[PDB]
């Protein structure tokens, strides 16, 4: 499963996460510090054309409409990550945990440089699937950062920033690979008992990641739990605590409805 | 002859850069029943290949690519509606050349066909104005009347007007459609080309104008315009339009912030 990407993918993605023309490092391929926002590494999901669904063989009675992306963990192993090239992704289940009539699956991936074999990204996605059966198995150990609950300490946030979400952001963001109609088609969305189309959880995650970098600098590890929906046109509020020399704990709040979109989350600074 | 392979992603990215939003899913969602492309999309072969820029620098002397300015553009869509995906093959043929002092005015033509059928999709006539250059004085082919029509704005007040904000970040998005010229994003190159800061692509202004016109008047299959003034990211456009027959909408594009004219001598031909 090979994915060839270039500066156009990088810039399209960076802009979707709020990169501006003031930040030429994000939007301009000839800038001396031209760079990709590291959450870009998850996009192998949409460019590893069939292989991505390899966890399904371990499931029974699997209905895709009943699947939820509950957690995501990403690591960058080669700093800084590349802004162009060719990467090969290997997918492997990490764990399956039967829970009543449902299953929690942890699905792992590793993306390497296709012309040297150098490890670039790794991802661990946690999926929650209703009305599904599976074996109770553990295929691999997980990094501490991936399973850390990252509870916000009982003090004031060291940082707070508001991030308006364009009413049209999902329309742009989906060009990075995820075409799910839930994020764009009102008929589909309302048909699915949503008030209107929702923003991609990974876009919320990225937006959060970008905002945190503007303040705290770059990170090579990120983990978060998805706890609530976000609508385009709404405003996100990122609350952040500096919890070690290494580690920024955060939450992403939705101002307009007084909910929480991202919780149990942190980044590890380079 | 360069082969251009494009898909829904290119179309939506282009359409969004021209101000298309989720209020108009026909421009921004590929599974919309009316999914379509704003037809200026057909010009992109002008900037998105190497044989599109080296194929005319062929009668050029002392050419600097950074000293290039786009002066007029004509586009015709021959196959309606324009495809939202496919493979297109383009042939470039010189139309005319002229020295004007130490600079050079060049009219360069192109025809774009489907790569699977040989069917004519788009025709383009670009007019370039290049600073600090030198060339022969020549004329190689005839031109459609619509391309050389001066389309003088009628003396009456416009039949229609609308303002179009230009995001400070729009050139960064627009250039992803193919024209990477650093003049539109890098202050160093913009000043190298004698502008105070990066300028918006002439073709983005052109396309923003086209999009506003379509919203009011419907689809067109033929467009021509003269570029007469710079536009900076962050400024506000004003499209002025005059209905000049059941067929033809004459327009100008003004810059509200500085009281200048960015596009003049311009019109579209409405589809049937």
Swiss-Prot record, chain B:
Induction: By growth on N-alkanes or fatty acids. Second trifunctional enzyme acting on the beta-oxidation pathway for fatty acids, possessing hydratase-dehydrogenase-epimerase activities. Converts trans-2-enoyl-CoA via D-3-hydroxyacyl-CoA to 3-ketoacyl-CoA. Its main location: other. One of its GO terms (molecular function) is (3R)-hydroxyacyl-CoA dehydrogenase (NAD+) activity. Signal peptide: none annotated. GO terms for biological process: fatty acid beta-oxidation. One of its GO terms (cellular component) is peroxisome. Transmembrane segments: none annotated. This is Peroxisomal hydratase-dehydrogenase-epimerase. Keywords: Fatty acid metabolism, Isomerase, Lipid metabolism, Lyase, Multifunctional enzyme, NAD, NADP, Oxidoreductase, Peroxisome, Repeat. Belongs to the short-chain dehydrogenases/reductases (SDR) family. (3R)-3-hydroxydecanoyl-CoA binds at residues 70-71, 100, 128, 179, 181, 202, 227-229. Disulfide bonds: none annotated. Residues 153-264 form the MaoC-like domain. The chain holds residues 630 to 901 of 906 of the full protein. Monomer.
